[PDB]
Write a protein that holds these residues in place. Sequence first.
Motif, PDB file in Angstrom:
ATOM      1  N   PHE A 184      37.354  34.309  47.044  1.00  0.00           N
ATOM      2  CA  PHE A 184      36.289  35.145  46.475  1.00  0.00           C
ATOM      3  C   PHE A 184      36.643  36.631  46.616  1.00  0.00           C
ATOM      4  O   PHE A 184      36.309  37.432  45.738  1.00  0.00           O
ATOM      5  CB  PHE A 184      34.941  34.815  47.120  1.00  0.00           C
ATOM      6  CG  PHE A 184      34.281  33.591  46.543  1.00  0.00           C
ATOM      7  CD1 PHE A 184      33.397  33.699  45.481  1.00  0.00           C
ATOM      8  CD2 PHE A 184      34.562  32.331  47.044  1.00  0.00           C
ATOM      9  CE1 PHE A 184      32.797  32.572  44.942  1.00  0.00           C
ATOM     10  CE2 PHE A 184      33.962  31.204  46.504  1.00  0.00           C
ATOM     11  CZ  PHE A 184      33.081  31.327  45.455  1.00  0.00           C
ATOM     12  N   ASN A 191      34.229  41.950  45.429  1.00  0.00           N
ATOM     13  CA  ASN A 191      33.521  42.204  44.188  1.00  0.00           C
ATOM     14  C   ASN A 191      34.152  43.433  43.526  1.00  0.00           C
ATOM     15  O   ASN A 191      34.024  44.551  44.028  1.00  0.00           O
ATOM     16  CB  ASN A 191      32.019  42.366  44.428  1.00  0.00           C
ATOM     17  CG  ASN A 191      31.361  41.082  44.887  1.00  0.00           C
ATOM     18  OD1 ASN A 191      31.896  39.993  44.681  1.00  0.00           O
ATOM     19  ND2 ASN A 191      30.200  41.201  45.510  1.00  0.00           N
ATOM     20  N   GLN A 248      38.580  38.339  39.347  1.00  0.00           N
ATOM     21  CA  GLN A 248      37.819  37.688  40.409  1.00  0.00           C
ATOM     22  C   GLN A 248      37.142  36.423  39.867  1.00  0.00           C
ATOM     23  O   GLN A 248      36.639  36.407  38.743  1.00  0.00           O
ATOM     24  CB  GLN A 248      36.768  38.646  40.973  1.00  0.00           C
ATOM     25  CG  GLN A 248      36.069  38.122  42.221  1.00  0.00           C
ATOM     26  CD  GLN A 248      34.872  38.958  42.603  1.00  0.00           C
ATOM     27  OE1 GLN A 248      34.391  39.782  41.826  1.00  0.00           O
ATOM     28  NE2 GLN A 248      34.378  38.743  43.812  1.00  0.00           N
ATOM     29  N   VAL A 249      37.122  35.374  40.697  1.00  0.00           N
ATOM     30  CA  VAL A 249      36.477  34.112  40.354  1.00  0.00           C
ATOM     31  C   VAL A 249      34.958  34.265  40.490  1.00  0.00           C
ATOM     32  O   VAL A 249      34.465  35.157  41.183  1.00  0.00           O
ATOM     33  CB  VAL A 249      36.982  32.940  41.220  1.00  0.00           C
ATOM     34  CG1 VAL A 249      38.464  32.679  41.010  1.00  0.00           C
ATOM     35  CG2 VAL A 249      36.672  33.130  42.700  1.00  0.00           C
ATOM     36  N   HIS A 250      34.241  33.383  39.789  1.00  0.00           N
ATOM     37  CA  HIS A 250      32.850  33.059  40.051  1.00  0.00           C
ATOM     38  C   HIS A 250      32.797  31.754  40.850  1.00  0.00           C
ATOM     39  O   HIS A 250      33.765  30.985  40.855  1.00  0.00           O
ATOM     40  CB  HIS A 250      32.068  32.921  38.740  1.00  0.00           C
ATOM     41  CG  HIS A 250      31.789  34.216  38.059  1.00  0.00           C
ATOM     42  ND1 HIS A 250      32.752  34.900  37.348  1.00  0.00           N
ATOM     43  CD2 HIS A 250      30.660  34.949  37.970  1.00  0.00           C
ATOM     44  CE1 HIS A 250      32.228  36.004  36.855  1.00  0.00           C
ATOM     45  NE2 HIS A 250      30.946  36.054  37.216  1.00  0.00           N
ATOM     46  N   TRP A 251      31.655  31.496  41.494  1.00  0.00           N
ATOM     47  CA  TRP A 251      31.460  30.255  42.238  1.00  0.00           C
ATOM     48  C   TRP A 251      31.774  29.052  41.338  1.00  0.00           C
ATOM     49  O   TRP A 251      32.435  28.108  41.771  1.00  0.00           O
ATOM     50  CB  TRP A 251      30.043  30.159  42.815  1.00  0.00           C
ATOM     51  CG  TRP A 251      29.809  28.862  43.524  1.00  0.00           C
ATOM     52  CD1 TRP A 251      29.483  27.668  42.953  1.00  0.00           C
ATOM     53  CD2 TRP A 251      29.939  28.609  44.933  1.00  0.00           C
ATOM     54  NE1 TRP A 251      29.382  26.696  43.909  1.00  0.00           N
ATOM     55  CE2 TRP A 251      29.656  27.241  45.135  1.00  0.00           C
ATOM     56  CE3 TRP A 251      30.252  29.401  46.044  1.00  0.00           C
ATOM     57  CZ2 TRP A 251      29.676  26.653  46.399  1.00  0.00           C
ATOM     58  CZ3 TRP A 251      30.268  28.818  47.292  1.00  0.00           C
ATOM     59  CH2 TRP A 251      29.988  27.464  47.465  1.00  0.00           C
ATOM     60  N   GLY A 252      31.299  29.110  40.088  1.00  0.00           N
ATOM     61  CA  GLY A 252      31.464  28.042  39.096  1.00  0.00           C
ATOM     62  C   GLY A 252      32.920  27.709  38.796  1.00  0.00           C
ATOM     63  O   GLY A 252      33.225  26.579  38.412  1.00  0.00           O
ATOM     64  N   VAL A 311      34.005  25.409  41.512  1.00  0.00           N
ATOM     65  CA  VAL A 311      33.430  24.099  41.202  1.00  0.00           C
ATOM     66  C   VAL A 311      34.288  23.421  40.124  1.00  0.00           C
ATOM     67  O   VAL A 311      34.656  22.255  40.266  1.00  0.00           O
ATOM     68  CB  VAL A 311      31.952  24.216  40.775  1.00  0.00           C
ATOM     69  CG1 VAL A 311      31.390  22.890  40.281  1.00  0.00           C
ATOM     70  CG2 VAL A 311      31.085  24.771  41.897  1.00  0.00           C
ATOM     71  N   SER A 349      39.126  36.416  34.322  1.00  0.00           N
ATOM     72  CA  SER A 349      38.764  35.129  34.920  1.00  0.00           C
ATOM     73  C   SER A 349      39.979  34.189  34.940  1.00  0.00           C
ATOM     74  O   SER A 349      40.224  33.515  35.942  1.00  0.00           O
ATOM     75  CB  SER A 349      37.594  34.507  34.207  1.00  0.00           C
ATOM     76  OG  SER A 349      36.395  35.201  34.505  1.00  0.00           O
TER      77      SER A 349
END
Lengths: 375, 375
Positions: free
Chosen positions: B20, B23, B29-33, B36, B88
Amino acid sequence: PNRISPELLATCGYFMPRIFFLNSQYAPQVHWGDVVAALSHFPAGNLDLSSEEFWYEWMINWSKVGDSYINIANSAKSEVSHVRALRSAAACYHWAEFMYFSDRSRKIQLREYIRSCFLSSIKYSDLLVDHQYIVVDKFHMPFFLIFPKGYKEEENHPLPCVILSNGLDSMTEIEILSLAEFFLGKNMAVAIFDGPGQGINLGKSPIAIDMELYVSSIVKLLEDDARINSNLLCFLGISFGGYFALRVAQRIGDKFCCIVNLSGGPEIAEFDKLPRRLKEDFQFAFMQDNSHMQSIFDEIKLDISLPCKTKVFTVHGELDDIFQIDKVKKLDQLWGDNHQLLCYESEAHVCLNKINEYMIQVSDWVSEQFWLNGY
Amino acid sequence: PNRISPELLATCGYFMPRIFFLNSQYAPQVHWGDVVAALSHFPAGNLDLSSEEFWYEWMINWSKVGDSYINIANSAKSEVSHVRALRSAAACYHWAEFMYFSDRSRKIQLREYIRSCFLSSIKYSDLLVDHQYIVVDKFHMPFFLIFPKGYKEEENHPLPCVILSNGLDSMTEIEILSLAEFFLGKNMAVAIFDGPGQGINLGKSPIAIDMELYVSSIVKLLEDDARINSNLLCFLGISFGGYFALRVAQRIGDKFCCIVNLSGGPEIAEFDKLPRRLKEDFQFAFMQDNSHMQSIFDEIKLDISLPCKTKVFTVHGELDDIFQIDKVKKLDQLWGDNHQLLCYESEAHVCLNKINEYMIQVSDWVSEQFWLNGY
């Protein structure tokens, strides 16, 4: 070593996409380390996510992380450091409060902290923010009209504007500003607001079912504002705000080029069969007893036979337990070509594992609708 | 519902602060999704984090998420959407490769993807990026001089500049650009670079122990550049880059107002007692056999009696298993007033649960040192 317990991490998997939300430039956002700070000393044997006891400990632990960032902000040697810390503080305080309903005064206090952080953040930011109150009868509605990075009135034609609505438990300058940045990034103005029972008004006034009345007052403001092209308006709502988006579509849809419904629906699932915390959530927002809530849900239910007066884009997950997919698909079929449905097969309410992806698609879709209306 | 298995989440707790990271506005940078998407269909019964089999599946699964974002980028209807998707993609491809060492060609390919995404991102960004090669003898070193948001040569005096170094497994435009944004935010220029065995050169050339030779060539460039105040330079290194920061301090420290060491140390812990993956990590970076690595570690070890020639700020965790805290504290004591140590009590290597917090402190500290040298 500081870490989140395997149990708590397994238990909190659904909220984690919500807590991290969108990678944002202006909207407050947590780092992974903030979650660790909040949950590393969380009491063991406390994993019942339906219980008040869990969310009390959640609140006080996240509050502690919020407090630590305020201390950093107060000691910060530059404005840029000050703002970074204030944003982190605001994010932490939001996750402290968003699912905490037991102490009305404490919840309001935490939302006041967030709003104070945000107003301070604006002061040292590069966005033109027009903050005022829109009088809707007796109600004084907090309102933010935000213009894109490096905006100049005379370098620009009247801009398109997206009005974004809070969900049940969102905070205006957190989730909604996060969504708004996708539109700001495309040189659109955005309008975010605290209607009755929304944002700073959550716990002060009951949430208004007829939120389109308050949206109408925003439209009238944007009509009068020379900087905004009122023929290029969008309304976006997330979660329960998405329900308002469907209401807006039915009642004042002709005022908008397009409307975005992020996982709202024409009716809510049975109140009694909701997870215990969502019951408390709805009760708090409506400032009502458990026994009165199903009656409100009945009143909330839309008449789908009443058509939408503009183009609507819905993003929805098949495993949504609040707004069931069958009711959305019923609406999709009946509303026809004017309604587009992006359905995610294995996603829960608000499809938060896909938010980065679908907000790219949504933002481009909105641009396209404005282009279709001659922008 | 798409989610990360409780087992995998419990197993991957250490890398999650790394994945992570910070910011960031520009750095991918990744997102939480994304996590997943990468881990939701990860094969069960595969949790051995020391094994090649785990990191192969890690690579192919993260690659898939990377690919999906490239598809979004290729179909994107605007430049802003294109860049969002490319960033992303780059983040996903980085986490695919950063701990994967079994296929040299595949790892290099993934780093090429990242660099391609980054160069594309710059084209539609609001930062002045001066990208060139610095010739150091026969070596052509990729070099990025990046100026603050809305920089104009004639509106500004010569700017301070922070040179930031990669760690063993960082990528220049991911972790290092993320760190750099704290300095860009304070109207400082930043210099990021791909030395031998660093960034795009990882797996192409062996990593140079004497990286200060390459830093010297950057200093000479910045001296000649009229836009940069070469009397207001900082060097920052993270992880193994932090080790280079200590070397820089000893050998060419007089060229810098201050130096920041993010969890580097004067010597590495016993090679044999390293976690199995870190062995592979060091082997790959140095392009060397297992049997040759302890000899290199012996060569790496600093003579702490040789003093630092400028102010040094070290951030270090007590539970660091690569650069042990005792050796850092030995150095801290011996180097005296010229060395400041921020030690986190219950933090592992690079104190990544505190990175947002300590980068605020670090950035303000650097500003202070420039101010102490009459800025």
